[PDB]
């Protein structure tokens, strides 16, 4: 029960957490009020929490956080601040604006594929990781030559999304390092923001400074928090959509060959990967008031963990849920969330993967998995450090 949750955090289960997720879902919703916790795993319950007007994303409303104690980016804020801050960047991430990036993405993918040397290569280092990094750095106005340092700080803050406090009552062993990385990143971005008051940029950071300096809609601290969020999302997400999709195709009869032969399968491959092997495995909410999900009540202040990975494999929603099937009639997932905090990066992530995947398959139609992949320790933003492909 609580043993199953700790098995999820155990690194030994990272390569295949799905038996555990499925077992938890079969058992039903987990009400653990003595741990100030509730764990939802059905599609219905996760959907309901994401939409519930009393579900909060601000940690200040959390009993666990208030006890641990004894601005955050808008991912972790509620209205009105969430509404205002998301509103300020949503146009920048709209499909119409993101579509303009297709030539840059295509040139990057081609360059990266050109540089691949056989007979074996790590998809992570050679493609899945560097593509999204180049794009987000350009978008935000962060110099690509500073990437070595972003990468390490970014990796640490991605890891910080693991629900150690909720599941174990203690902070991560990485806590001190993560605070240091957070401070470094804020200071770093502050300096980039300050130079944009002197030299005109053509990037999102500059656009945000223009608004901040014109009125009361935005503070410098908020620009820092927003850009930090965007930079990290750009480093720590799409990489896993690409790599998880590659892995699922390599493991599933005919799938790599089918995409190599027909790039139009890319969209279905991507959405079925979001369902079957989600880059973001779980999200957290806090009950802003006593609330009901299905027949279960969650006390005000308790953490609600939503195991999206389990929800995507709910047999009441999808047939053969544990099969990777890009040809299935209905692909339904919550891999980009739902409602107020729905992923702002979804058009960009989709575009990045839509260009990358069919190009990869077409370039190496005879590709096979070489050995078994190695996983990072991360639970929430779960991904491979090594995915070896023999060409
Ligand atoms: C496949 C890649 C991605 C996945 C799977 C993913 C997943 C998610 C999920 C599940 C959420 C909702 C979290 C919640 O409800 O608490 C979210 C929110 C968010 N995502 Fe993504 N994301 C991806 C790529 C990106 C990219 C590339 C960016 C931009 C660089 C981005 C920017 C954001 C932002 C700003 C939010 C917060 C939205 C809000 O709070 O209003 N994402 N994402
Ligand atoms: C500051 C960390 C932001 C990285 C999150 C990227 C978007 C994915 C949402 C994950 C929510 C648990
Ligand atoms: K201001
Ligand atoms: Na908006």
- Using alpha carbons only, give the angle 258, 374, 248 rounded to the nearest 5 degrees: 20
Ligand 2: residue whose CA is nearest its atom 4: 233
* Per-residue burial over 296-317, b = 16 or more CB atoms within 10 Å of its CB, e = otherwise: eebeebbbbbbbbbbbbbbeeb
User: Mutate which of 233, 307, 349 to test ligand 2's pocket (most atoms within 8 Å of Cβ)?
Assistant: 233
Say whether 46 counts as a known binding-site residue: no
Pairing mode of beta strands 120-122, 37-40: unpaired
Which structural domain, as residue segments, surrounds residue 204?
A: 1-391
Taking residue 225's Cβ as centre, other Cβ atoms within 10 Å add up to: 21
Ligand 2: residue whose CA is nearest its atom 9: 280
User: Mutate which of 93, 150, 161 to test ligand 2's pocket (most atoms within 8 Å of Cβ)?
Assistant: 161
What does residue 304 show for φ and ψ, rounded to 5 degrees?
A: -115, 115
Token pair listed for 365: 């139609």
User: What is the Å distance from ligand 2's center to 345 Cα?
Assistant: 11
Task: Report the run of H or E that residue 111 belongs to, with start and end.
Answer: helix 102-114
Query: Which residue, 320, 338, 316, 339, is CA-closest to 329?
Result: 320
Pairing mode of beta strands 55-56, 283-287: antiparallel
Q: Calculate the alpha carbon distances from 378 to 19, 73, 192, 245, 383 in Å.
A: 18, 21, 29, 18, 7
* Per-residue burial over 175-212, b = 16 or more CB atoms within 10 Å of its CB, e = otherwise: eebbeebeeebbebbeebbeebeeeebebbbbbbbeeb
Ligand 1: residue whose CA is nearest its atom 42: 345
In the DSSP assignment, the letter for residue 388 is E
Distance from C-alpha of 256 to C-alpha of 276, rounded to nearest angstrom: 16
Which residues make Cβ contacts (< 8 Å) with residue 159, sequence separation at least 6?
A: 172, 174, 178, 376, 377, 378, 381
Distance from C-alpha of 138 to C-alpha of 140, rounded to nearest angstrom: 6
Ligand 2: residue whose CA is nearest its atom 5: 233
Which residues make Cβ contacts (< 8 Å) with residue 347, sequence separation at least 6?
A: 93, 94, 95, 98, 99
Residues facing residue 121 across a β-bridge: 389
Count, residues in the chain? 391
Map tokens 């205002």 to a residue. 84
Query: CATH number for the domain including 202?
Result: 1.10.630.10
Domains held by the chain: number: 1
Distance from C-alpha of 287 to C-alpha of 168, rounded to nearest angstrom: 19
Q: E strands within the chain?
A: 30-32, 37-40, 55-56, 120-122, 283-287, 291-293, 296-298, 303-306, 368-369, 374-375, 384-386, 388-390
The sign of the dihedral angle between the CA atoms of 346, 349, 353, 355 is positive
Q: How was this structure determined?
A: X-ray
3-state secondary structure of 326: coil
Say whether 296 counts as a known binding-site residue: no
Please answer whether residues 260 and 35 qualify as being in contact, where contact means their C-beta atoms are separated by less than 8 angstroms: no
Atom of ligand 1 nearest to the CA of 241: 1
Please answer whether residues 84 and 216 qualify as being in contact, where contact means their C-beta atoms are separated by less than 8 angstroms: no
User: Mutate which of 91, 92, 237, 243 to test ligand 1's pocket (most atoms within 8 Å of Cβ)?
Assistant: 237
């Amino acid at each position: 029960a609580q043993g199953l949750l700790l098995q999820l955090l155990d690194p030994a289960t990272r390569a295949d957490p799905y038996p555990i997720y499925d077992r938890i879902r079969r058992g039903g919703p987990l009400a653990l009020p003595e741990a100030n916790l509730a764990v939802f795993s059905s599609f219905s319950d996760c959907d309901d929490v994401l939409r519930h007007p009393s579900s909060c994303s601000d940690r200040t409303k959390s009993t666990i956080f208030q006890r641990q104690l004894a601005p955050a980016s808008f991912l972790f804020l509620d209205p009105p601040d969430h509404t205002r801050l998301r509103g300020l960047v949503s146009k920048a991430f709209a499909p119409r604006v993101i579509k303009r990036l297709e030539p840059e993405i295509t040139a990057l993918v081609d360059q990266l594929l050109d540089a691949v040397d056989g007979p074996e290569f790590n998809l992570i280092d050679n493609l899945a990781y560097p593509l999204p990094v180049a794009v987000i750095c350009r978008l935000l106005g962060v110099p690509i030559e500073d990437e070595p340092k972003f990468s390490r700080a970014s990796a640490l803050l991605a890891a910080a999304l693991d629900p150690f406090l909720a599941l174990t009552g203690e902070t991560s062993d990485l806590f001190d390092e993560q605070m240091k990385a957070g401070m470094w990143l804020r200071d770093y971005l502050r300096a980039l923001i300050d130079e944009r008051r002197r030299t005109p940029g053509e990037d999102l950071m500059s656009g945000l400074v223009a608004v901040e300096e014109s009125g009361d809609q935005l503070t410098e601290d908020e620009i820092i928090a927003t850009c930090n969020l965007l930079l990290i999302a750009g480093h720590e997400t799409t990489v896993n959509l690409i790599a998880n999709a590659a892995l699922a195709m390599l493991r599933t009869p005919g799938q790599w060959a089918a995409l190599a032969a027909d790039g139009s399968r890319a969209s279905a491959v991507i959405e079925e990967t979001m369902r079957y092997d989600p880059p973001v495995q779980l999200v957290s909410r806090y009950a802003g008031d006593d609330l009901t999900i299905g027949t279960h009540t969650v006390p005000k202040g308790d953490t609600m963990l939503l195991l999206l990975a389990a929800a995507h494999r709910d047999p009441t929603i999808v047939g053969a849920p544990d099969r990777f099937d890009p040809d299935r009639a209905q692909i339904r997932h919550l891999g980009f969330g739902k409602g107020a905090h729905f992923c702002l990066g979804a058009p960009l992530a989709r575009l990045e993967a839509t260009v990358a995947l069919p190009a990869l398959a077409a370039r190496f139609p005879e590709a096979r998995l070489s050995g078994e992949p190695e996983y990072k320790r991360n639970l929430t933003l779960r991904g491979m450090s090594t995915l070896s492909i023999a060409v």
